[PDB]
């Protein structure tokens, strides 16, 4: 029992603290703190009473089994991997899809999800793209920002919202959320000159155009 404090020393570099173990002793104040030193269940049957032993023994055995794996440590399930993001993507940037069927459509990024997929949404008045997930790899992070730091992203939408559950029909829950976030960005993309015309246009490469030659 007690109030569990944060780490007394900060992470200086990953795997390194700012204070030595001799410096952590006096910081922890241990110099004044010498600390010295189941399944058998009986149940009545109306006879007498009987005792079942739960997790009862298996009744069939395959001829051969695989022996157990060795114990490795740096192999964690996907729900506990760290989620990275390019520094060029700041919320309010305009992206360009490359692999999804909205190829080259100019689309607006909003936020990062839990899994690592991104909440990138096109204006449905301009882009015909809903609130959609798209991985950061398939993204052209353009250097064109809009201050979406005043919009209110809905908390009820998450990674499970966009799962392919099981013919697709847009559910009546889905048509609420596309409208509710639109009511702040649709005026914001018109406070910027020639921006709603940018998003209707689709990205493409012409002759004599090289991506490494240009900046976007």
């Amino acid at each position: 029992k007690g109030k569990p404090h944060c780490s007394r020393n900060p992470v200086l570099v990953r795997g390194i603290g700012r204070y030595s173990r001799s410096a952590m002793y006096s910081r922890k104040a241990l110099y004044k703190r010498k600390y010295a030193a189941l399944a058998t269940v009986t149940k009545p049957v109306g006879g007498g009473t009987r005792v079942v032993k739960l997790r009862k023994m298996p009744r069939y055995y395959p001829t051969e089994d695989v022996p157990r794996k060795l114990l490795s440590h740096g192999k964690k399930p996907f729900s506990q991997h760290v989620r990275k993001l390019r520094a060029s993507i700041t919320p309010g940037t305009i992206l360009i899809i490359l692999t999804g069927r909205h190829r080259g459509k100019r689309v607006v990024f909003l936020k990062q999800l839990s899994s690592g997929l991104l909440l990138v949404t096109g204006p449905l008045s301009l882009n015909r793209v809903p609130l959609r997930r798209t991985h950061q790899k398939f993204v052209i992070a353009t250097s064109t920002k809009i201050d979406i730091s005043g919009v209110k992203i809905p908390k009820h939408l998450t990674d499970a919202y966009f799962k392919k559950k099981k013919k697709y029909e847009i559910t009546e829950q889905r048509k609420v959320d596309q409208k509710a976030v639109d009511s702040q960005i649709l005026p914001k993309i018109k406070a910027v000159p020639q921006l709603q015309g940018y998003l209707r246009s689709v990205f493409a490469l012409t002759n004599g155009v090289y991506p490494h030659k240009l900046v976007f």
Partner: peptide, 19 residues
């Protein structure tokens, strides 16, 4: 101190230095 042969008696105050 770290001697296993002649330092048996040596590593004694430290087991009481932790308590």
């Amino acid at each position: 101190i770290a001697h296993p042969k002649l330092g048996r008696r040596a590593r004694a105050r430290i087991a009481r230095g932790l308590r």
